[PDB]
Amino acid sequence: EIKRFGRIREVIPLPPLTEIQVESYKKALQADVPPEKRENVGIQAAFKETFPIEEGGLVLDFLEYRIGDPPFSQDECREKDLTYQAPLYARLQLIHKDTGLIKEDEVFLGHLPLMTEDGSFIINGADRVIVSQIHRSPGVYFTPDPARPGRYIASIIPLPKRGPWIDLEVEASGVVTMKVNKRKFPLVLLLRVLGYDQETLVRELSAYGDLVQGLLDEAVLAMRPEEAMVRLFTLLRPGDPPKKDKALAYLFGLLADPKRYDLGEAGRYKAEEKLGVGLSGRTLVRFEDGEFKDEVFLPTLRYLFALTAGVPGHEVDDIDHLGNRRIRTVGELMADQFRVGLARLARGVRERMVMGSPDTLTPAKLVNSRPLEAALREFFSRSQLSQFKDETNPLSSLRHKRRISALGPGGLTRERAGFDVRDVHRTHYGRICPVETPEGANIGLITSLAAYARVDALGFIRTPYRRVKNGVVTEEVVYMTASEEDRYTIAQANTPLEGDRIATDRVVARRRGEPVIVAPEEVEFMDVSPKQVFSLNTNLIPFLEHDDANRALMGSNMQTQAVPLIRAQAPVVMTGLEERVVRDSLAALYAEEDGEVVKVDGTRIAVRYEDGRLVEHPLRRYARSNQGTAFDQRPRVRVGQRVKKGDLLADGPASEEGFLALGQNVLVAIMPFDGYNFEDAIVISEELLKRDFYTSIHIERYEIEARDTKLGPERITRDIPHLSEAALRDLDEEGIVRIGAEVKPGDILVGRTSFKGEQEPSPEERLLRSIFGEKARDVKDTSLRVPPGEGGIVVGRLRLRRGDPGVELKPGVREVVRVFVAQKRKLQVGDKLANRHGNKGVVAKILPVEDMPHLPDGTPVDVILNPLGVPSRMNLGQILETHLGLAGYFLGQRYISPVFDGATEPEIKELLAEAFNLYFGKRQGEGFGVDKREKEVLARAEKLGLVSPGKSPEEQLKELFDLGKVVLYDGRTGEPFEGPIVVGQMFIMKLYHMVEDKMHARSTGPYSLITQQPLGGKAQFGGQRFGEMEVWALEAYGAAHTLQEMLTIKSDDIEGRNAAYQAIIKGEDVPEPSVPESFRVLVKELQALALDVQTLDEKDNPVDIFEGLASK
Template sequence: MSLHTFGRIKETLPLPPLTEVQLKSFYDFLQLNVLPDKRRSAGLQGAFLEVFPIEEGDGRSRGGSGLVLDFLEYRIDQPKHTPAECRERDLTYQAPMFVKLQLIQRDTGLIKEDSVFLGDLPMMTPDGSFIINGAERVVVSQIHRSPGAYFTVEPRGAKEVVAASIIPMPRRGPWLELEFDNANVLWLKVNKRKFPVTLLLRVLGFNADAVRALMGPTAEALEPTLREDREYAPSEALLHLFSIMRPGEPPREEKAVAFLFNLLADPRRFDLGLPGRYKMNHKLEGVYREMKWKLPKYSSEDYAQTLLSYDPAQAAKSGLYFQDQGIVPTVRYLCGLHLGLPGYEVDDIDHLGNRRVRTVGELLGDTIRLGLGRMARGIRERMLLGAPEAATPQKIVNNRPVVAAIREFFGRSQLSQFKDQLNPLAELRHKRRISALGPGGLTRERAGFDVRDVHRTHYGRICPIETPEGANIGLISHLAAHAKVNALGFIETPYRKVVKGKVTDEIVYLTADNEDKYIIAQANTKLGKDGVTLEGVRGRVVARVRGDPVLVLPERVELMDVTPKQIVSVSTGLIPFLEHDDANRALMGANMQNQAVPLLRAEPPLVCTGIEDRVALDSGTLVLAEEAGVVSTVGPRLIKVKNGKVEKEYPLTRFTRSNQTTCIDHQPVVRPNQKVQAGDLLADGPASRQGKLALGHNILIAFMPLEGYNFE
């Protein structure tokens, strides 16, 4: 059947791999194709580097005696069974994980090296799912507030007050909250205990005059706070701060210094992470410039070293700037907002520049980090109890906490879900789902209207149509067809570059906060006869700036949408003539396609939108040739393709039960002696025909539009 396209807009960018959000995240987490000494401190490698070295005692004693267990490298062997065997025999598709560890006796300098089995790690199948006890599961990505500094306006009685929050990565420390009270005193709140923010500045060596100099034109806002907080020397301020935060403990200087380090500089206890550092620098760049401070690097380690050697008596002399977590610039920005100075803006927390996606790799990394942390506590106990000379890495490591954490995550986490296998589209949609629920996320009861609503920054990133109709409306969403999740977890969408009114084929991917800087034309903007010059109505084209439509000269346009399809998800993009569909009906249509039961005789649609083949291909339900050759055998359960002397076998799944008790059945589409190329279709899966998604039947209908009067 030949395909006739009625579209008038040239497709410049094909759909990206639709399961990339799952596969890329998992492969980046493992870094298996990278040499051990070249691996980045991220994913699995990052989890090990954060927990190790494990030292005898509290883990922060530098030098001295005792045992130290250090991490060298990890390796992951091949899985023992294939995915098909695991499905058949109710096994978990997993691979053994080994860690090479080094035990150092600091007294004698003796080093013992050992490879330790740390448990089996579930592996992702080529289609982006996991097989746990024979059942296929999908780890859904989670969207949450990005770490960084946020400035908001909160109502208090009849007036509004400005407040700021410094938010670390999930499970990486407490929120630091700054707010003015009715007397205009600025308080810093940590773990439900609060103190005047100037007290912390005094601990770091700033007296009242130094604080005023530091705040520059915004210093006036801190005058009531300076009056409230009496003039302390750094050592007094430190003990006073410690007595506020730990009221039951006697204030001793060494304990107070350790507390300060834990609160503000230990990356294990408070960490903004790369996304938080990026957001903080992005927001406070102007303030750093005004203060003549250099923007901090994306690392907490340099700063942690400074605080390790913190001495209250030296604090005033050394001028120890608390740059890393950005408290001082945050205070200055908040004071500027409080005074109503120009150039200071509050944040929109629903803007997608302020929300990021935690994909499977990050969620799994957090799980393993949790298990390693529990394992480290057990290792420290065994170091203290056993004889140092008899200790080996194998003897002091117990992998049970890591195994338990992994099992708990895949078996019980709200984000590890039983895969929706009703049809190929349902599978693909499940892997591209984004949830605001789950550990550390929102709850249905607490989520208000603003969080659930469509935001202008969803354009090209999150589908405005496809979401459940019940209590989860707006909390469960789906990635738009062309959207990608970048290395920091922010969602990007593609645009074509426009140079001097001429559109080019150069593609740029932009996050929501970067997009706000540009003037962007629609994909359906009229082009001249040459196919590249923008032509407007009466010399102007419709574009948008920060989501608002504007009429501009073609020369002012900087970017252009790649396709009208980029604003919707894959499910919604399968609906023909979507633009004539009422939004509520489109939502129902997008959701109902995923409920279509595969038919015995699939029938491809007569009217389609052109992405049916990509959906079937990326769902992983088709059987494709891995290399070119000639089909030698076509049987009910096996297809063989011969390439020279080598014959490759492709087993077919016949009449197998899916998770939703529908039938998974492969039907061969090739004949013996047929030549095939790599990537060619060998067998159709459920609900597909000739490699195209085929969910229903073409039925003959009579349609009467009575000038719109018969709508509903």
């Protein structure tokens, strides 16, 4: 039984959620599209813009480009640690203009990474994702001057790397100046070769009066195009002598060049429909008949000077408006860097022509792979927009793919982001999620795409709206951009409808993000659903209306950090979007067509389809993710039942019968318990550990590399010189651990022996060597032993040895050996737990089932959360989730409560009443009345007035029950709690952070070579960084020797820490240190700057801190 709530029925399903990456990268590839009929956009745009090139008398040209088949599959590339990529073969024809020589000849280009079905790539055996970027749309815009309050500065701008920014600013002389690449010069001087003089600039130009005379300079207007071309080339590029042809070529490459300067098609269109003009190409000017002719400058100066006059129709543009902002998707970025590398390749080609034999050269000798190869390699590996995929759960990768970042190259950075780009504009409504975003220095920068939000060809995010005609709603759904939305007036999804038409006389609407109460006659549009106003993770929060924005944000962000559990369960109360989440995540196996299940088992689910073909679906079982969370698929189908198409076969790590299972549903009691729940700490009933609740599987993988050092070759073997028998147990043959062996920290995963640097044993050492007579042997033990705090069972085994097929290993290295190690992690003291409503917490001590606040039927609660966390953070959604969770626990059904179309108080109260009828009815059915302790609690609840006086204990327990509060007995005493306490089912989540990983301590470890400071982090077996603030703390206390130890002995001081460890070992008090030894480095570094650093004494005399060392 599953119950649905709400009257708002989405007419349109949620569009494919992985579609941004997949479709954008689809349009930039055109693999199945014939080389003839291709779109000339994306990669072929790069080709056509880099070709043909002509510069003797060679003329190149392009023809086609071909996608190769992947040399290795996904899994193979992943376990070889190789990028998943396929050879791209450009077919390019080479010609000679003067000779007429045609040698066509195919060629190579490089390796191009292919996007998977989920929408992520694989680079160097690691799954990575390219996040979408947000910047402002190309075109021209106008904003008031920062310096001058009285006027409006103009700006022209193309795509990035497609040419420079342009600024038209009136300096206050009254004269006008233009700024491109940090410099100053009047506009007329630029009007120049564009075919304009004094008259053409004074003709129409004045509707103005005062504005015409600041433009004109007669000295410039006297000289004509090529002369002032030399002039502007002298100003803007002082480096080379002011040649005329250099000026021509350079300033042609700056503006009129379609290749070198590409203004966005969206910018082309928008600028065309703004200035009230039209534009031939994407170029600022056109080079025609040897003379430059104007395109952009004239209408934009027209609009500039018009707007500054105050004439109607002309207005300042909104910068943060999403109609002026566009999204870089993965395909456009990939194609961008592709064309950069293509340009470098073009230059390589151009260098290779002028030498060798200009008569006969095949394009094969003329073209190199490395420019494009290294360009793409650099973009995929390095670039900020390319980051490590989030594999913690399916929803992790999903949201990570739907993420929109303002950071990265070409975008903005942490420092230049003010309240400008961080804020939420009017137009963020159906496009960008107003809540979900990191709670860090990155707030407002990295956001998520809305549920129904889509990105069109021009990069403008658009959102669905249902058109309505005269109070009558139409089934036609229109996807509208920001400006298009701004034009119309839009109603709300919760507006009352009487069977497809409007009821009320007062309808909630908006004109450009401005709430207005207005009649059904003037409404032309309506929201499809409230869901489109938020992201995916935000849409998973039930009763979101009752939770504050901050804790909602925290809720979503924590839902991202979700670890999968073995028994993991879908929430009792859901918003209904979980299904599509598990579907579009592609972490689950479905039925591609109609058919029948002919077998199950945990490897292959075979289905005989109606089409006659027998197709088996291999199941991935326990695959290591990026964060370590196990990726597992459990089949639910019986053998021999006929499946429908699209029907579920096997679940995912985070799936239950086709529903998203993040955490589990537990029985929560909201109440203080012995200060154990203090500060959002979480007490937990031990019973969860009995049922294997919140138990997660984490596979961590370790690798090792056998090399050939100049000393001698490394080798993987069972033989180790000083190794005892018992430590070599599971190592069976080649010195690798067997499958299914428990490995303790310190135990050897794989053995390795590397010849030691040949040196003498010390006199004492060799005395020992002689005493035991054990031959000092050759090789020394390099074996990989599992790090402290980590351990588990061995599942996977991988050995890649060189001289063997299918694998190419880097020079010098013989063989790499890699071991999968899986761990079973139960909930432990210190682990993190949280809910969908943004209530964080740590596990604070677990409690035995014996003593628990329980029910009269003996049912103990599973958690005991603290109520004090509620009123400050102001999330009341968890309360409702607890009430409905109670009702659901008792009547045994789940719920669907969509965001902003929810369940309501009377509904929940009714369900509580019914559930109580069943519960108490079963209490009296078993021959039991009302307990005395319950009469006590009911009495004191009656005195404070939680229940109506005069009513029998049954009706008072009833009135208390629908309040969510029931009578609770203390398991320690047996006495009831004085007040009634709300209990019920809450959906609670185990998250990524655990004590298992995060607990580390160190005594004496490795130290850095440069300065003797200990290394950082746990992985390096590091010590804790003592900051300057902590120094200030110690100084404030006035502890001199504590601060001394911190600054000398216990940190970097060599002789200090040595003599100290010596002293403690011998049972002394540690001596007084001398030289921090980083300070000596500071001294000699200062001396490297030729600064004499003299450490003096009481009486102004040299004291040498280098003892007989640097003295000379």
